[PDB]
Design a protein around this ligand. Structure first.
Ligand SMILES: O=C(O)c1ccc(O)c(I)c1
Ligand SMILES: O=C(O)c1ccc(O)c(I)c1
Ligand SMILES: O=C(O)c1ccc(O)c(I)c1
Ligand SMILES: O=C(O)c1ccc(O)c(I)c1
Ligand SMILES: O=C(O)c1ccc(O)c(I)c1
Ligand SMILES: O=C(O)c1ccc(O)c(I)c1
Ligand SMILES: O=C(O)c1ccc(O)c(I)c1
Ligand SMILES: [Fe+3]
Ligand SMILES: [Fe+3]
Ligand SMILES: [Fe+3]
Ligand SMILES: [Fe+3]
Lengths: 200, 233, 233, 200, 233, 200, 200
């Protein structure tokens, strides 16, 4: 068969990822422009929401050194690739969990519906990549919302998970924080209620 | 906005390290027990951020000046980012972090007894040029002990992050230095089953790029997932 | 006083570097043009100073404390001094000097741009024990450019001076570190015609002597000229 | 044949040799006890003399970074091996050439006569080892006195040098410095008047 | 009392059999799932009991008399206990146990249909001498079927327990006999991943130590962790 | 790098370990002198205690063929390495689990405090090595006492265990047996409450 | 390490170099446009001078088949790389030694000062490459002027030569030819007063 060049092999980020990708957290001076956890400026169109979660290891212990990257469509269901701190909305962000409490937070807007390759619409979702010490190659998952049940029922992606019980691991639970619409999305790396992770 | 025009060659999960690699202790409790679910590529997975307009500082990529001069071996780390089809990946984001000459990281959690270097930070970023090239100026990091086995030492390395054209191509890896005896003893290195794959992570001494009477140079090329046009879709 | 009681195996001047090695530029004008004159060994050549009663300081052999802590890879340099017959050389003087982690020497004539380290002198001395063992505690020196060819760089190294039992065994050498890619490119290293001889100068990583979570260790054994009793003289 | 362990290969001392073996000269703080250029204390028996010289390269240029080691017998033709700063006399010493003037000096006494392995007397002499940048392996020589022509003429070692004109290269010339008896010994590493160097 | 004056070379857990080895059925439920936690050596770990003053009986090490004569192959099992540095381990306790010639153990739980031997016990102990030597006199044990796979048989073996200088050195192992065809088929033996390590468990026929017209001999040397003095600690 | 001789590989003790190291148990005649479970003689200084426990496999089943070795300081926190049946106290002992009940016992004294290499005191502890069928290489652990919480909280060793919940697995629960002070230390080889095992 | 394609190996020019690069000298018909020894036209600005010299071999014998190439800045210390026979000044020229007298001549203007890479001014000088039979790879050297002592004392290139006596070999001695300002620069390939040759 035909073989192309092999992709460069992945390596864990280690415990000090923060010094490189999350300066503040490393407890170090930051640069003029940093890629952080605020995708939307308050003047951005769409429903402003706060996302928060904890990451657990197979023993049910908090993973206090995780790093997360998110990719999502804007409110119209459009992916905004041109990253600029001037933009009201950026499709990309980064967050990490507290060395203390161990919770990450993200400030964005509820993404709009996007069609799959076959023209079938997918339920609103946030694409997430998880990085950390002990994770050789990052984990891919999706955050869906519990208040989009109608949509979730028909998602061609969610429909790909054989067992209905597993689909629920992908559904963030709506709440409110300081009077703001928040969604809690805990990731269980292993064991009971282990989160669905994808390959694409 | 982003367009679903591309398809990315499927990842070889046998080339990359697996999630469960027991010698690397922390991987036990941090690896899934269920199989990953494969999903068809959609616009969601085939698009990603473009950092062409991030406001990089003048010494973003110069670790000698971006933090007195640091103590240590002055080197330049350069290379090119290409895809599996060998096509250059222009205007892509390359990030790196590392310890000082003594293996001490400037991070609160680093308690190793090697002292901090008053003139050294350890962070850099660079956007590849039209040809997929990047370069950084720094000091060669020192190995350091870590709590794995009772006498484990990481080989000297630089941590790297590369974005590429989409989130399907984004990768974090580690650069190792040519000839380092610590390489083959590392459980993290060995997380990789294929020794051929390990070779891709070793930066080669590059005398051609060195600045005579000043600093040495290392060559590190990166290969991201092959990008192709959709067809008969 | 000293007594003419022993003979020393003749030096192999094809094993050691020759005087005229043109790639090493300075050797051209500082190498004799006439042949060395061989002379029989006498009390004059078979005796030497015994440093047993030199008043050695407490940190004479700890480069970490003899000059804050220095910046760089903490390592122990240890080994044994034996003769060609494999017999230990006890109570012998071992002296060393080296550059700092950046390749900078604490000498008025060193103007390389890498900075000095306020906590590092770079000199040590140690008297071998009853088993011929010596050990130093220092930091791994860095490579440095020098005025030979337009892009010449010395591999990291430690300078060594060993007394031995007489003036006939006295030697000045250099230790190189396992896997350094710079070794095969060095004109000085290359003054040595036999690759096998080069290997004798390469200190090996010794994980067994390392102090977990503290410092690495390198092993450097030294072979001095064999000492035998005179016979049928 | 029988092959033993090969001796560790020699390497040039390089230009910074002083830091390691001539502290003062590197211009660095010295230690309590240092091995230097004064082999005899005023009350040492024998005739107190001053030794001085310069070292030349193949171009007739001064080698200003040379390092020298000396080994000699006392006034009674005795080798004192037990090195001690308390001693009235030490047979071992070290010296180097000035970065400026490039002249070395030594304070000792004229060595007594010693016999060779065959029981034959050697003329009073001082054993020298020359080290420096550009020298891959140290050079061995001997210093004899011009005021010992009788002894010199019968020296079994001096006599090994085929050509008489070459023997001259090893004879120090008497002088007086500050009303003190001195001998000048110049070393010429290469070319016209090249000093005799030994192998043993 | 005991003093903290030594350090032991870290174990190579890739050399030793891993905990989880599925072909050896009982290991499934009897292996940890969490990683071992590495700790620094202290007086707790670097000390151990000295059995110098235990009151050893006259036939403690002679299985031919310590329990008529037993039926089976009369053999001497001897060797030396050294550390990884090759240094002898004097006055150390060596304990052993085995089945009879038919593969039957003198243990309540053994119901293998091969009969017990009225003159055979199967236990021995020996304190090593000044040079690390130990020796036992016994009969060669037979192989036996065990409940693993439907047709699993243990190769003939002698179980060994050795004390060493500390609890850090304490080890339990099994000796196998040179050329036994069952060796490479055993799941317990195969628990050991490196065939090279397997070789260390095979006692070699020692014709030089045999007693003509009496009994054969087997040589089995044991290597304990390397003991070193602490330095720059 | 430097390679030393490889240590002899470990093998499981097997189910018949008793005939070798626990004769009584094997149900065999013992010898004059045996190493058993009584570390202290009634007239031994320090607080006399009884130690007892059970060993569980990964399915929650009792491991009835287990063999244990203990190493501990005396009441003065001194290790008595000179093993002798005449001593009032021996730092070393052996025990096994009953084929019926599957419980092991030890008669000792609560150990005194010992300092780590860096001069820091460790909480009173008993060093344990566990051997059995199914166990390829012996497991190391420590037994701490729940009534030494103050010392325990400061132990440089206990402090090395990252997860606090994991530390609790090393703490023996004080109780009384026939009006005698006892501590119960159960070992869970696998699964829920798995005991911390060390490498050193 | 990284290895590039190897540079094509040098080879001596041979005795007939003239037929290819010095047609006139070869005593053959020249072509319309030729590259020769007149860098400056009468009306080219700067002090017009005549450069002359001889080349000596190791035996002190004249080298009559030498081919030289020169490169120098104009009177303004500017490098004129667009070679044109129309130009008033060309920074490049070629000359050779007479098969008879064995002297080469060049007609140019005294070069202006140029800065080294570090921003330091170099004394006025002409870059020369010497080719000839017996020379495997061309020799590089520089011609400096005796009437620029002040500048000479400060040249970063000149000061790179260790022994002062060697620097003098690079200085051309001003003279007058037909009432014209000249400078003589003899090249000594080997031996007594050997000319300094560069590597770059
Ligand atoms: O302490 C650790 O586990 C640790 C530290 C640094 C680093 O780069 C890695 I990967 C792991
Ligand atoms: O990759 C592996 O080894 C792996 C994956 C999943 C799983 O449940 C187990 I157990 C092992
Ligand atoms: O060793 C050599 O190559 C060597 C020695 C002496 C000498 O005069 C010459 I010319 C060359
Ligand atoms: O400058 C030089 O030539 C130089 C410097 C240092 C050193 O150790 C050596 I060898 C040579
Ligand atoms: O060593 C192994 O294979 C191993 C270790 C721990 C663990 O939890 C698993 I699943 C496998
Ligand atoms: O019956 C078993 O499983 C069994 C018996 C004896 C023995 O030595 C071993 I290892 C296992
Ligand atoms: O005569 C010679 O030396 C000669 C002639 C032609 C040629 O190409 C060469 I190179 C040398
Ligand atoms: Fe790191
Ligand atoms: Fe040096
Ligand atoms: Fe058995
Ligand atoms: Fe030709």
């Amino acid at each position: 068969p035909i073989e192309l060049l092999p992709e460069t092999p992945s390596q864990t980020a280690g415990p000090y990822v923060h010094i490189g990708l999350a300066l503040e957290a490393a407890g170090n001076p930051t640069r003029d422009q940093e890629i952080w956890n605020r995708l939307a400026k308050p003047d951005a169109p769409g429903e402003h929401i706060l996302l928060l979660g904890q990451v657990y290891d197979g023993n049910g212990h908090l993973v206090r050194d995780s790093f997360l990257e998110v990719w999502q469509a804007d409110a119209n269901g459009e992916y905004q690739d041109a990253y600029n701190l001037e933009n009201a909305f950026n499709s990309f962000g980064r967050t990490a969990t507290t060395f203390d409490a161990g919770e990450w937070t993200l400030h964005t807007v509820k993404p709009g519906v996007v069609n799959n390759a076959a023209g079938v619409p997918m339920a609103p979702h946030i694409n997430i990549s998880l990085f950390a010490r002990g994770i050789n190659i990052h984990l891919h998952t999706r955050l869906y919302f519990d208040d989009e049940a109608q949509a979730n029922a028909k998602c061609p992606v969610l429909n790909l998970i054989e067992q209905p019980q597993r689909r629920e691991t992908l559904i963030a639970k709506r709440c409110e924080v300081d009077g703001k619409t928040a969604y809690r999305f805990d990731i269980r790396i292993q064991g009971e209620g282990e989160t669905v992770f994808f390959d694409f | 906005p982003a367009q679903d025009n591309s398809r990315f060659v499927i990842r070889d999960r046998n080339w990359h390290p697996k999630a469960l690699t027991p010698d690397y202790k922390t991987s036990i409790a941090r690896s899934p027990r269920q199989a990953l679910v494969s999903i068809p590529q959609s616009i969601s997975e085939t698009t990603g951020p473009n950092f062409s307009h991030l406001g990089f500082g003048a010494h973003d990529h110069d670790l000698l000046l971006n933090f007195g001069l640091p103590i240590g071996e002055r080197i330049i780390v350069a290379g090119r980012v290409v895809d599996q089809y060998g096509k250059p990946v222009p205007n892509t984001l390359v990030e790196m972090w590392q310890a000082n000459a003594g293996g001490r990281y400037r991070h609160k959690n680093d308690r190793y007894l090697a002292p901090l270097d008053p003139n050294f930070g350890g962070v850099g970023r660079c956007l590849t040029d039209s040809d997929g090239y990047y370069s950084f100026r720094t000091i060669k990091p020192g190995p350091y002990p870590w709590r794995n086995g009772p006498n484990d030492w990481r080989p000297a390395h630089i941590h790297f992050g590369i974005s590429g054209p989409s989130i399907a191509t984004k990768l974090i890896t580690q650069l190792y230095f040519e000839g380092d005896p610590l390489i083959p003893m590392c459980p993290i290195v060995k997380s990789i089953a294929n020794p051929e794959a390990v070779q891709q992570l070793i930066a080669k001494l590059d005398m051609n790029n060195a600045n005579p009477m000043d600093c040495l140079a290392y060559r590190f090329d990166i290969v991201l997932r092959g990008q192709r046009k959709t067809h008969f879709e």
